[PDB]
Amino acid sequence: MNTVPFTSAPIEVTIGIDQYSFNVKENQPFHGIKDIPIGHVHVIHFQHADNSSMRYGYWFDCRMGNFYIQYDPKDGLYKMMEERDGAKFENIVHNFKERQMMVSYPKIDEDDTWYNLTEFVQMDKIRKIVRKDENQFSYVDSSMTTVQENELSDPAHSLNYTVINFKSREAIRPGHEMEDFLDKSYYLNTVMLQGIFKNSSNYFGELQFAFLNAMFFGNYGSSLQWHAMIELICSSATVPKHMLDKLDEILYYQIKTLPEQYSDILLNERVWNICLYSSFQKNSLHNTEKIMENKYPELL
Amino acid sequence: GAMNSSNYAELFNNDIKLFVDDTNVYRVTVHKTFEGNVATKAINGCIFTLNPKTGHLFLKIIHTSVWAGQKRLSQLAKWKTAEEVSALVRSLPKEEQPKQIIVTRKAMLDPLEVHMLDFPNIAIRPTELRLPFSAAMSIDKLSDVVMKATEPQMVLFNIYDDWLDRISSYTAFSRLTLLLRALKTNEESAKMILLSDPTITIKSYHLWPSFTDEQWITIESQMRDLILTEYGRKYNV
């Protein structure tokens, strides 16, 4: 179990750690979070009490170093930092654990939600999508744009997600125009799986990262990517049996963890009514379909 | 964007453009089988690709043979239309390729866009107008060449005959549409009008009779009357 301590909490903010959150008052005694499970990526995120504009957050992994949060009053946000000094670190964290100034990452033991949402997500790939290499952790917020969006403006603050475009040359083999556009198997399996992602786990990982950035930060370009990558599999007649099974589990938990009052903006009607009821794989997503009908039949 | 009454005069500027109509590409005759079931038998179709400014018609003949052994023919007809339109463009010299292509049925947007991925500077557009190009097969010479063809075949026409010698594009297009609209609403009568007077003839290299200008006004009037009526006959007013 590891710890993300805080130098202080100068402004009133709601802090999130993975799917958990808690309100901190202006200048409340508060030196961070403890008991964070090792072996998963995490994200710790922020929504100021004054300006609900700009949710922002840091993806990180406790194995890749010691990371703490001091507020920056010039830039006006909680920043993630990384010390070297192991010994200064262990002993200062120990001080706060002693005065009990940290909240406990509150994991119920029966619960595998986080594992399920982040099964295939690895910090190595996150850092390729969010380019900023002097830091072991990755900053994301509400308004960052994707590589594909800037095609249609600041590249440093982009999310360099894999570009998917159904009406593109990459996706459509000359001479198979109609075949490749109504059965994307070629695009999924050869171009993307064999070509760009190499295996389904890097694919699924980008999928899972996109959705999490949509949900936590309401990043619109992320929700587009999540939806595109779902659509490409469901519109593929030929998908390995194991991908179809894993995808059903994956989506199931993403739909499970979505806030019920957020479904109007983060869920795309066309994509889901197609994946669930028209696409090749309309029969292959039993758990995902079952929960979407019991929880969001309005959309359908 | 979409094409409608408001941006109506763009068709006649100097940017090359083509209308594509696909109604008559997949044509069937629904019959009864010996067992008392129903089957379709296909007959020849055409893609009606037309330059509304010059009146050049690229009449691509779709021969029944193209459907042999295929499923979901109504759906394939749209992709086959897109494939033939894209090859026509490829065959044209660059200075002749259209900058725009207007499909008369919105179902053709995606098939063409995909077949035209190599032509990003050509804009594919739909339209809000209810144009009557379906009636193109009521033009005898056009029906004739289609039904007689024995293999795939492109056949070039000018749908305006010689009109442009005396009238503007704008006006030529309004006569074409007024003629097709009448042929669509009541073919028999429309044709009776065009060929009542045996003294007016159809030159062998034309599609429509050789009317003088005065005759064309008389003829145009009579077509408008027909179109109004069949709207009464149909709606009781």
Ligand SMILES: CCOC(=O)[C@H]1CCCN(S(C)(=O)=O)C1
């Ligand atoms: C009283 C304010 O506390 C702090 O500033 C410490 C808690 C964060 C951890 N560090 S460290 C590891 O020494 O860089 C500083």
